[PDB]
Amino acid sequence: LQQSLELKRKMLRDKQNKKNSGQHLPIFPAWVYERPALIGDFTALPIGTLPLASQESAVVEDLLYVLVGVDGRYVSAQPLAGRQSRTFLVDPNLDLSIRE
Amino acid sequence: GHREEPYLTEAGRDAFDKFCRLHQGELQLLAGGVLQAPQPVLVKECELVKDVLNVLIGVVSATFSLPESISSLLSEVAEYGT
């Protein structure tokens, strides 16, 4: 997202020099690359101390947010915003039956 | 009336606990005090069954990481899931 800006330009130069039947290949703007806002994956409390039959509803709602890349409420999105994947952290004080 | 005073054969959820506590303490004396199983029941019935239901998934629970004669009952029903 930031580290990729180098590799793109070297690859573009390789194809720009090669083309003798033309000049000037186009590019997409910088905010296509830099922004983690156009991708799907861009206060709090410990979930474990809650009653069980409220914990299930809260954790299920958070997980459904988590699957589509949106940061949770009692699942925190660990820092990235470079390459591919991302990781998430549910609290380790969550009840065992739910946690597994 | 006062009643014919129900026997130990009849009453079985309070005298049952009394007998369970008593034979547990008797066995603990007959070894010396190095056995140590409190609680004739506990946690509940449904909690232990849900625990064992999670044992059959093949993962962690609240009594494993995957009277006092409950352990003999518990071993064959946990060993299904192991």
B82 vs B76: CA distance, rounded Å? 10
Long-range CB pairs of A29-34 (<8 Å, 24+ gap) are A30/A5, A33/A1, A33/A2, A33/A4, A33/A5, A33/A8, A34/A1, A34/A2
Query: For residue A66, how far is the Cα from the chain centroid?
Result: 10
Optimal mutation site among A52, A95, A96, interface B, most CBs of chain B within 10 A:
A96
Q: Which residues of A touch B46 (CB under 8 A)?
A: none
Contact check, Cβ <8 Å, A100/B59: yes
Q: 3-class secondary structure for chain B?
A: CCCCCCCCCCCCCCHHHHHHHHHHHHHHHHHCCCCCCCCCCCCCCHHHHHHHHHHCCCCCCCCCCCCCCHHHHHHHHHCCCC
Which residues is A88 bridged to in the sheet? A77
Contact check, Cβ <8 Å, B62/A100: no
The resolution in Å comes to 8.7
CB atoms within 10 A of CB A55: 19
Q: Which residues of B touch A97 (CB under 8 A)?
A: 50, 54, 61-62
DSSP class of residue A76?
E
Technique that determined the structure: cryo-EM
Are A75 and A63 spatial neighbours (Cβ–Cβ below 8 Å)? yes
A25 vs B25: CA distance, rounded Å? 89
B81 vs B74: CA distance, rounded Å? 11
- Residue type at B43 in one-letter notation: V
Query: For residue A37, how far is the Cα from the chain centroid?
Result: 9
3-class DSSP assignment, residue A87: coil
A23 vs B78: CA distance, rounded Å? 72
Interchain CB contact of A52 with B (< 8 Å): no
Backbone break loci in chain A, preceding residues, C–N > 2.5 A: 42
